[PDB]
């Protein structure tokens, strides 16, 4: 288990930092929604 969700006021209302490792190659995005 390695997944990380951060933000405020979910479901298409504000940005969100997400941290998910992709085979020891850590993918980190900061704009996704729901």
């Amino acid at each position: 288990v390695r997944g990380w969700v951060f933000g405020s006021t979910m479901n298409n209302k504000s940005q969100s930092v997400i941290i998910i490792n992709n085979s020891t190659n850590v993918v980190i995005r900061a704009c996704n929604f729901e």
Binding site: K13, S14, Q15
Partner: protein, 48 residues
């Protein structure tokens, strides 16, 4: 040329380098409006 707007309504001050983006109409006590309801503005204005 009114392509440049500003936000002027928020519950509370900002933190340093806090970034506010979301566009929801305002009411001073929670309670989400729907314009043209009374005392429910838009959270943006133009420069002039």
């Amino acid at each position: 040329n009114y392509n440049y707007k500003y936000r002027y309504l928020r519950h509370g001050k900002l933190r340093p380098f806090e970034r506010d983006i979301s566009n929801v109409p305002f009411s001073p006590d929670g309670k989400p409006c729907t314009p043209p309801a009374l005392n429910c503005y838009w959270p943006l204005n133009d420069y002039g």
